[PDB]
Amino acid sequence: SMSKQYINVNGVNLHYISKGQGELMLFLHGFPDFSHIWRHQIDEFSNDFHTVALDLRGYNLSEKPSGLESYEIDVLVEDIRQVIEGLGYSSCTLVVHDWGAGIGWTFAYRYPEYVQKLIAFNGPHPYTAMRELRTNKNQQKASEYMKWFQKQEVQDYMERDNFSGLRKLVIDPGVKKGYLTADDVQAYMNSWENGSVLSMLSYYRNLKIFTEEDLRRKSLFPLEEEVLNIPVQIIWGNQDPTFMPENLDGIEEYVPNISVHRLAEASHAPQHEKPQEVNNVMWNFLNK
Numbered sequence: 001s002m003s004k005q006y007i008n009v010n011g012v013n014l015h016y017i018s019k020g021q022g023e024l025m026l027f028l029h030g031f032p033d034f035s036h037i038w039r040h041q042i043d044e045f046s047n048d049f050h051t052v053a054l055d056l057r058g059y060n061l062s063e064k065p066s067g068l069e070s071y072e073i074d075v076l077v078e079d080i081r082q083v084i085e086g087l088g089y090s091s092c093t094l095v096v097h098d099w100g101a102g103i104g105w106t107f108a109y110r111y112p113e114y115v116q117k118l119i120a121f122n123g124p125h126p127y128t129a130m131r132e133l134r135t136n137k138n139q140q141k142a143s144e145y146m147k148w149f150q151k152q153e154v155q156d157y158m159e160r161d162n163f164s165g166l167r168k169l170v171i172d173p174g175v176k177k178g179y180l181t182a183d184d185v186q187a188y189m190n191s192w193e194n195g196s197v198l199s200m201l202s203y204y205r206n207l208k209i210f211t212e213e214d215l216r217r218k219s220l221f222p223l224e225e226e227v228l229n230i231p232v233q234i235i236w237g238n239q240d241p242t243f244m245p246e247n248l249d250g251i252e253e254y255v256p257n258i259s260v261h262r263l264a265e266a267s268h269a270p271q272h273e274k275p276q277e278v279n280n281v282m283w284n285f286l287n288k
């Protein structure tokens with residue numbers, strides 16, 4: 001029942017996984033993954049939703065436009081908007097992780113009419129993310145790798161030696177912990193062969209979180225609204241190196257109507273680390 005194909009939106013062709021029929025469940029991955037990370041969710045909800053897992057511009061088989069400007073939050077947000085539309089929908093249930101959550105969160109605040117329900121995994125909340133980057137010394141040690149992703153020299157660390165950098169970041173842990181199969185691993189290797197690490201990096205080269213005058217602002221990306229009122233669910237890997245727990249502190253002020261599930265065991269990418277647990281929390285949330 002699973003299809004893979006393209007969609008023209010916003011001046012690009014995005015590759016996307018598709019399965020099932022009905023109301024739209026849209027999954028947004030992040031760095032350095034792709035549509036595949038959502039495999040377990042697609043298998044699970046596709047008899048109740050039309051599950052669509054998208055390859056963010058630059059990633060895997062999606063077009064890879066040139067210039068930092070092609071990877072501005074405004075652009076990416078519009079990408080998402082055009083996708084719900086062009087898939088035949090005026091709204092969806094939006095499931096987000098990492099960079100996809102940065103985009104997703106922003107989209108949701110900006111277009112609450114387009115999101116019936118938001119499910120968010122480890123990744124930046126527009127408001128708290130900024131707060132912890134100011135107050136949380138642990139979050140700054142944690143986010144230090146971002147200062148680093150700005151340098152040209154970085155991409156070679158990642159691609160060099162058959163993607164040594166990326167394999168040890170993502171493949172090694174998951175193979176030894178048991179959540180990556182040998183086919184999952186071929187899947188990833190191909191995605192990095194087929195996508196561009198340059199464009200992957202370009203997402204960060206637009207981040208305005210570096211100058212002291214950059215850190216002053218309230219929201220990670222610009223936002224008129226400071227409250228999101230749709231039903232939201234956080235599913236959170238408590239042991240994630242890149243995001244400190246304080247990120248979820250006082251979050252209800254910015255999302256009244258939120259539910260939060262913390263996996264003390266799981267790390268950055270709960271969705272494929274502990275699929276059955278993540279899946280049951282999702283079910284429960286979807287029916288509340």
Ligand SMILES: OC[C@@H](O)COc1cccc2ccccc12
Pocket residue numbers: 030031098099102123124128129130132133139143207220242243247
């Ligand atoms: O607390 C804030 C930090 O997480 C900042 O990190 C990020 C900012 C914007 C996009 C991001 C995407 C993926 C991971 C981290 C991101």
